Design a protein around this ligand. Structure first.
Ligand code: HEM
Ligand code: HEM
Lengths: 145, 145
């Protein structure tokens, strides 16, 4: 249940999400491309789903990949801004869930983003505590897939 | 080209866009729903395109419509944040253009959003100068359709 999952975002979890987002969200282009390209590097088997972006190995030089990555960071911005109101967080999560359901992305494969998030966070000196907080946010989307 | 339309946005136009966005972008749920519902009210012929959202006459109560409307405001947030780097503005504009090209939305039809934008701006006392600035931003997307 997406609602029960949203209920797992306690005061402490919300605070860790906001504190870490202040840093990672400050460079959406740089950190977004880092996040997406790490997903491709660590899970080569997912590249097939991103056929529209062309040659993803080009990273930042690929305009479609850059546009996609920046936009992905605004989806995360959206989630963070809705943390105060569960009903609104749920309706935006379900909107993005549909974007992935139509692409045939399951909850398990969506969860493959946790590795990249942990790595990007670690590179900015945010440890497991923060990675786990972000895993709980990702879990809300998973509940909707 | 889209780059041309983007590169033409002047300092004065960007200033007007940012100043008005500070206000209308401060309540994404409220102003986003107002924007979308006004489109339906003034251009009833477009309702059919949004069948995935269900009964749009439900307004704010319709969770799918609310999720869609909030997300639309983040696309605008994205655009506003990329104003000073035409290269980044172009790649995000083309990303959203694809979302509309796939739904068979023509440049002319995309321009129907100008009426609703003008009304929402007016509700916050932003006059014609501001509506014209926003029409210039919308025209950047139209260059991609
Ligand atoms: C933090 C997690 C993620 C977020 C917030 C996210 C967000 C997004 C957004 C905003 C889009 C654009 C939707 C559209 O315009 O149609 C998108 C597209 C996509 N996402 Fe994700 N995504 C995430 C993780 C994943 C993962 C882990 C996979 C695959 C295992 C995945 C696969 C896709 C695919 C295939 C597309 C379509 C790309 C295209 O053809 O344009 N996403 N995602
Ligand atoms: C300020 C202008 C507009 C912006 C920034 C915008 C933004 C968006 C976004 C972010 C989406 C979601 C894309 C996806 O996840 O697939 C969307 C979907 C859509 N837009 Fe727009 N849009 C605008 C104007 C319009 C106009 C004027 C029309 C129609 C005449 C239109 C028709 C559609 C349709 C049919 C969908 C699909 C809805 C669904 O089934 O989920 N858009 N738009």
């Amino acid at each position: 249940s997406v609602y029960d999952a949203a209920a797992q975002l306690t005061a402490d979890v919300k605070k860790d999400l906001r504190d870490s987002w202040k840093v990672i969200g400050s460079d959406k282009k740089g950190n977004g491309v880092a996040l997406v390209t790490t997903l491709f590097a660590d899970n080569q088997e997912t590249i097939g789903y991103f056929k529209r972006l062309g040659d993803v190995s080009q990273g930042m030089a690929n305009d479609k990949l850059r546009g996609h990555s920046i936009t992905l960071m605004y989806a995360l911005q959206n989630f963070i801004d809705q943390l105060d109101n569960p009903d609104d967080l749920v309706c935006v999560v379900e909107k993005f869930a549909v974007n992935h359901i139509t692409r045939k992305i399951s909850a398990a494969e969506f969860g493959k983003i946790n590795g990249p998030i942990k790595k990007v966070l670690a590179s900015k000196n945010f440890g497991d505590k923060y990675a786990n907080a972000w895993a709980k946010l990702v879990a809300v989307v998973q509940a909707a897939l």
